[PDB]
């Protein structure tokens, strides 16, 4: 019975779950490890039985443990239990989110936040730009993408947005649905203001002289809303 | 002369020409195309068998006397499904054909001479294939390596630095120092290893520094920023240094669409991950690039084969892989997928047609490392059940389909990453990275792994037992896995630049260090049995994929083979 | 409780068998791994109980699983289950052959053979020789042993058989019981016809000139049926 | 697609599959068995031809890019008579098949990649064979080497120390010091060279000392005393050191007859000179040893083919070779020959039947060094005229006879002397010792010789001419023949013992020095197309030779081919 290391690990997990189940039958309130093992082992056994789908197992995993079956804090600590179970149609990942309702008594590692908002990009004035997605697919723009060089299917006054980025929380994104028109707030890019990469429209220091070169490049490459004069004077390096 | 019944002959020596064997519990039937043996002179090892001093073991052997011979093996390879003896000498495949003693048998070449220095391995009734090559490996944990090895994968090309978030998302080993970390850690494992650098940089100097530090290629991943500028610069540096470039395209369409990505690629050889899109914003239009010549398309484990439960796990896998918190409204709103059952079903049919050339895992980042081979054969079996025999079959067998799906994970990734000179097939001169399967367990559980001419992993029973068979039998490391033998058995692949600069002596590596080559001048036409370049008309309004006009689709499988018959969990 | 690695492995196997038994009680049809583990664990437990012999356990292992208790193909895949069990009289290997009857529906890795016989040693004409075993023990001769140099207790016309081997499937053997007389078919040894090793009667190229030397050597060493002339002329090297 | 007339196609590219070409002015017809080319993609060099930058010369070549490619060559080899491109890289044959540019042509393997570093050689309408191997060379004068080279022989195995009487009689380089003399003198010549030591010694220490000094084998010659004791000791030492033994048996029956010589040999591999006897006392019974497995029989030039004038010169050649003064009554009385026209005629038929495996010269000692190939093909043509097509011919061609007679001087001597790993055939991995013939001049006058991947000898016109063709055209040394290029081009064969002891550094040799191997474990069965072992019943009362009962004889040829049509003198 050639056993793979994955199978050996799953056997250990199953017997940890069996121990948790025996303790629960004895009436011991389960801790974090026991609760996670119990849920995982139950999901694995149901999948092996093969009468349920992954959706049914995701639903059923949330009914195994009542709030009174676990110690205080276990429900807060357990956010989701993932387990790769072998179904009749192969191995699938079953994820159970919030399997136990939080009692609220004890929250390990809980945050005690101030009731004061965080002001981001302080000292930077934001301008408003109307953007239309004339493409056929939604477009997501990150907080730190150079907005001048976004997808050419987005239509807006690119001259206004040269050297700027979205004024949103860093790591978040703004989505433009096709045909949809939105108004976004843009703030100047900080630091050295050297734009490199993106769509290679600038690839240099962002100033008024590089703005003309960027606009001419964008117009040549077909970026919507980029307006460059017909009589454009080239420089020695561009 | 004498005639013996074919049943008795096959029981003694395994199937011969014209005999058919079912592969695993699937519906695929492989027919032995030809046999190198001479009937009545077969090599057998045992009590009073032929492999004995003076009968088949030569007392005056040739100077090319084999170190190991595998007898009566059914070689299943992209070069053909045939029956032969495999001779291994000095870590390479010395010869394929009729082995034995020239003094007492006819038709024995000098390179297949069995002598007193030869070990014998009974392959009768056993299938021999080349070791798998997995090219999407997220090196998240070293425990992936034994899992893949037990699954039958002998070469892992990928990137990562442990369970960092950059590695959880991307197949990238960034920088000279991290490359040194990974190359020096690689000495521990029994697996050929290759590492990819970070291609997401508009700095030619940085990219070249990574290649000279030892990466065999670049990975441009959306999570580090897949922009046209980065694609262009990485492709320029890779054309300079003869290394592959793999890409996982931009999901958000931030800088452009599939057309803009293809314009940045500009008809240069590129290896694409998730050519079906995997729910990205380029989907389903990114499937169109699978018809281009310069694109080598690969598909990941989770979406093949298309089953009833395939779509349920995709969002969880996507969120965890891309590191989006499920308790944050902004991250949940950001986690937008364009996945469709139409695309997931079309992926299997494209694999069957040969539009997709490489199968891989993307281990522990939307993909299972120990299921590349199993899911490849599940897809092959499902397509055989659905569409029947391929029109290219020249007989009452599935040999063409077998060869196509075997190339998907043996020779095609080797060609893509420029290591096909060393690994990828059972050919003379290649390194002896062989996998021995029993046909009942083919595609799911190998009998043993030969790494560099020595057995490295094997099914083994109780150590205290009086024979190797009794329970518990599981996969154990053999002697090629231990001591300084693993240094001789295993290969670290580096770029030619690092090899010339002397990366082996500089980093004090004890493994064989080999340079990759011929990565830039390959197209889809160079893939074996998977070179179909067809205009893929993708209607995104209807999410409909057409090749040569005909629409492609498949029905979800309610029950796949090689899944629950073979695994306790 | 000093535990050896063998004991740890056996504990893992026992709990795999326990899991298989629980699944069987639940009514899940066992797969290959579960069936093997169940049989092995049951044998180990019976041996530990110590009321049965190894023969009784070999018999009993074949009654544990009915054909309807396992998935299709499991019975075909399982040929024999070996397990080293600690009896009251030490560790013994219990082997259960064909523990489950094959249903015949699905046979993994099954062969589809042609209905045509294989002709071995084609193009080689076989001569017939009568061999008597005048010794007290049976003698087995392999397919590729040089028949001239077989056990000297076998009696036959060795001159007829110089340079020849048995015309049987390679790897098989012919057994001559004591006192028994058999007729065997012999074919010429192929290739270079260089005989080395065996009983060191030839140790050179097999031709008519070496035949005389081999016959004289066999007569000197007492090989039955070897007839050499009394007035034998030696060569420079022999 | 388009169809062009076969006549025009053959004029442009040479014969293709199914086309037949006459060899020289003989009656032998060679049929192209198969063609590796893809029609419409043939490689041509010229003004507006295909071998140009970007069309067939790759702009992104593989790393195995060829150094030289021979295009559209008709390869005539023991492995088959076919049409292909021959790629040469690093002095070896890198590949055989369809060469060109992978970017613009289909079916081009990586090892046949034409690139900017590739030189082109138009082989269209030209036959390519392996260089000849002459194994009976009496190294009497160094002027023999250019003569054999111009005849088409690229390897010379023999012995001698200049025109000493011992060398005039025997193929022997006696002793460590004389072997050093010859090995150091060998640096001058453009020819692979191997030297045989004196086997006529009952001293194992002396024989072993010669082998360690660098001889590739032993020669036991009657003129130094061919006694059974010497034969036995030489064979023992040669089995110890894995080197060939050649024998020229006792003419006088001083110590014994053929039976005693064969008893001393004792069924060990032995290469026999003048297996027809050449008038010796062992004749005609020595022809019986040509049926034994352990004897590799060779026949010399002068007695093949049997002609009207064959018997007239034999006594003069014998007396001068054996150093018997023609003005001395005692020497004239001693010079007794047992030669018969029956034996001379039977020699040609034995060659046709494959009883005799090797053709050689015995240069300037009863044999002509520059006529081995010519006389082999004269014998083949004479036998074709006499007995018609062989029964082994599978078609309306003489391919089997061509392959048999070509093996007689290409692959069979290489196997006999243990150098078949390096030379003897046009195969991938062997050294590029190739001969280019025009089919009108096949077997008599080559077009050019490629030695170690570079042209070493060629027909050339006036040096002051505006083209290479105008008269006078004769054979001139090319650049591989000069400077330090000949060191890279040529090979000196030594024993494995001398190679291990470092004979190259010890003697300061600049040529490649290669060890011979697999000399002791070969029999007549290992000769290609010449492995016929038949009981040869020789009636000495009637001088009648029978094989399988049927008597063998041939009629003298009044006029042979390839003799007066091609040579002014």
mmCIF file with all atom_site columns, N, CA and C in Angstrom, chain D residues 176 203-213 218 237 241 497 501:
data_model
loop_
_atom_site.group_PDB
_atom_site.id
_atom_site.type_symbol
_atom_site.label_atom_id
_atom_site.label_alt_id
_atom_site.label_comp_id
_atom_site.label_asym_id
_atom_site.label_entity_id
_atom_site.label_seq_id
_atom_site.pdbx_PDB_ins_code
_atom_site.Cartn_x
_atom_site.Cartn_y
_atom_site.Cartn_z
_atom_site.occupancy
_atom_site.B_iso_or_equiv
_atom_site.pdbx_formal_charge
_atom_site.auth_seq_id
_atom_site.auth_comp_id
_atom_site.auth_asym_id
_atom_site.auth_atom_id
_atom_site.pdbx_PDB_model_num
ATOM 1  N N  . UNK D 1 176 ? 60.616 -0.853  -27.252 1.00 0.00 ? 176 UNK D N  1
ATOM 2  C CA . UNK D 1 176 ? 60.182 0.435   -26.731 1.00 0.00 ? 176 UNK D CA 1
ATOM 3  C C  . UNK D 1 176 ? 60.861 1.590   -27.453 1.00 0.00 ? 176 UNK D C  1
ATOM 4  N N  . UNK D 1 203 ? 58.939 -14.233 -24.106 1.00 0.00 ? 203 UNK D N  1
ATOM 5  C CA . UNK D 1 203 ? 59.193 -13.457 -22.898 1.00 0.00 ? 203 UNK D CA 1
ATOM 6  C C  . UNK D 1 203 ? 58.006 -12.530 -22.651 1.00 0.00 ? 203 UNK D C  1
ATOM 7  N N  . UNK D 1 204 ? 57.210 -12.878 -21.638 1.00 0.00 ? 204 UNK D N  1
ATOM 8  C CA . UNK D 1 204 ? 56.051 -12.070 -21.287 1.00 0.00 ? 204 UNK D CA 1
ATOM 9  C C  . UNK D 1 204 ? 56.462 -10.662 -20.893 1.00 0.00 ? 204 UNK D C  1
ATOM 10 N N  . UNK D 1 205 ? 57.600 -10.525 -20.210 1.00 0.00 ? 205 UNK D N  1
ATOM 11 C CA . UNK D 1 205 ? 58.069 -9.203  -19.817 1.00 0.00 ? 205 UNK D CA 1
ATOM 12 C C  . UNK D 1 205 ? 58.354 -8.333  -21.032 1.00 0.00 ? 205 UNK D C  1
ATOM 13 N N  . UNK D 1 206 ? 59.034 -8.885  -22.038 1.00 0.00 ? 206 UNK D N  1
ATOM 14 C CA . UNK D 1 206 ? 59.329 -8.113  -23.240 1.00 0.00 ? 206 UNK D CA 1
ATOM 15 C C  . UNK D 1 206 ? 58.058 -7.741  -23.993 1.00 0.00 ? 206 UNK D C  1
ATOM 16 N N  . UNK D 1 207 ? 57.129 -8.688  -24.130 1.00 0.00 ? 207 UNK D N  1
ATOM 17 C CA . UNK D 1 207 ? 55.888 -8.386  -24.838 1.00 0.00 ? 207 UNK D CA 1
ATOM 18 C C  . UNK D 1 207 ? 55.093 -7.299  -24.119 1.00 0.00 ? 207 UNK D C  1
ATOM 19 N N  . UNK D 1 208 ? 54.978 -7.417  -22.797 1.00 0.00 ? 208 UNK D N  1
ATOM 20 C CA . UNK D 1 208 ? 54.258 -6.416  -22.025 1.00 0.00 ? 208 UNK D CA 1
ATOM 21 C C  . UNK D 1 208 ? 54.954 -5.067  -22.090 1.00 0.00 ? 208 UNK D C  1
ATOM 22 N N  . UNK D 1 209 ? 56.287 -5.066  -22.103 1.00 0.00 ? 209 UNK D N  1
ATOM 23 C CA . UNK D 1 209 ? 57.016 -3.811  -22.214 1.00 0.00 ? 209 UNK D CA 1
ATOM 24 C C  . UNK D 1 209 ? 56.713 -3.120  -23.530 1.00 0.00 ? 209 UNK D C  1
ATOM 25 N N  . UNK D 1 210 ? 56.635 -3.879  -24.620 1.00 0.00 ? 210 UNK D N  1
ATOM 26 C CA . UNK D 1 210 ? 56.272 -3.264  -25.894 1.00 0.00 ? 210 UNK D CA 1
ATOM 27 C C  . UNK D 1 210 ? 54.865 -2.676  -25.850 1.00 0.00 ? 210 UNK D C  1
ATOM 28 N N  . UNK D 1 211 ? 53.908 -3.421  -25.293 1.00 0.00 ? 211 UNK D N  1
ATOM 29 C CA . UNK D 1 211 ? 52.539 -2.908  -25.243 1.00 0.00 ? 211 UNK D CA 1
ATOM 30 C C  . UNK D 1 211 ? 52.470 -1.636  -24.407 1.00 0.00 ? 211 UNK D C  1
ATOM 31 N N  . UNK D 1 212 ? 53.137 -1.623  -23.255 1.00 0.00 ? 212 UNK D N  1
ATOM 32 C CA . UNK D 1 212 ? 53.157 -0.417  -22.434 1.00 0.00 ? 212 UNK D CA 1
ATOM 33 C C  . UNK D 1 212 ? 53.928 0.708   -23.106 1.00 0.00 ? 212 UNK D C  1
ATOM 34 N N  . UNK D 1 213 ? 54.883 0.375   -23.973 1.00 0.00 ? 213 UNK D N  1
ATOM 35 C CA . UNK D 1 213 ? 55.592 1.390   -24.733 1.00 0.00 ? 213 UNK D CA 1
ATOM 36 C C  . UNK D 1 213 ? 54.713 2.022   -25.791 1.00 0.00 ? 213 UNK D C  1
ATOM 37 N N  . UNK D 1 218 ? 50.178 -7.012  -31.346 1.00 0.00 ? 218 UNK D N  1
ATOM 38 C CA . UNK D 1 218 ? 51.351 -7.807  -31.663 1.00 0.00 ? 218 UNK D CA 1
ATOM 39 C C  . UNK D 1 218 ? 51.262 -8.310  -33.089 1.00 0.00 ? 218 UNK D C  1
ATOM 40 N N  . UNK D 1 237 ? 49.739 -12.494 -23.334 1.00 0.00 ? 237 UNK D N  1
ATOM 41 C CA . UNK D 1 237 ? 49.997 -11.094 -23.002 1.00 0.00 ? 237 UNK D CA 1
ATOM 42 C C  . UNK D 1 237 ? 48.936 -10.191 -23.621 1.00 0.00 ? 237 UNK D C  1
ATOM 43 N N  . UNK D 1 241 ? 46.418 -7.466  -21.887 1.00 0.00 ? 241 UNK D N  1
ATOM 44 C CA . UNK D 1 241 ? 46.468 -6.034  -22.168 1.00 0.00 ? 241 UNK D CA 1
ATOM 45 C C  . UNK D 1 241 ? 45.413 -5.549  -23.156 1.00 0.00 ? 241 UNK D C  1
ATOM 46 N N  . UNK D 1 497 ? 47.055 0.619   -21.907 1.00 0.00 ? 497 UNK D N  1
ATOM 47 C CA . UNK D 1 497 ? 48.102 0.685   -20.895 1.00 0.00 ? 497 UNK D CA 1
ATOM 48 C C  . UNK D 1 497 ? 48.996 1.898   -21.104 1.00 0.00 ? 497 UNK D C  1
ATOM 49 N N  . UNK D 1 501 ? 49.418 5.184   -18.727 1.00 0.00 ? 501 UNK D N  1
ATOM 50 C CA . UNK D 1 501 ? 50.735 5.610   -18.276 1.00 0.00 ? 501 UNK D CA 1
ATOM 51 C C  . UNK D 1 501 ? 51.114 6.984   -18.797 1.00 0.00 ? 501 UNK D C  1
#
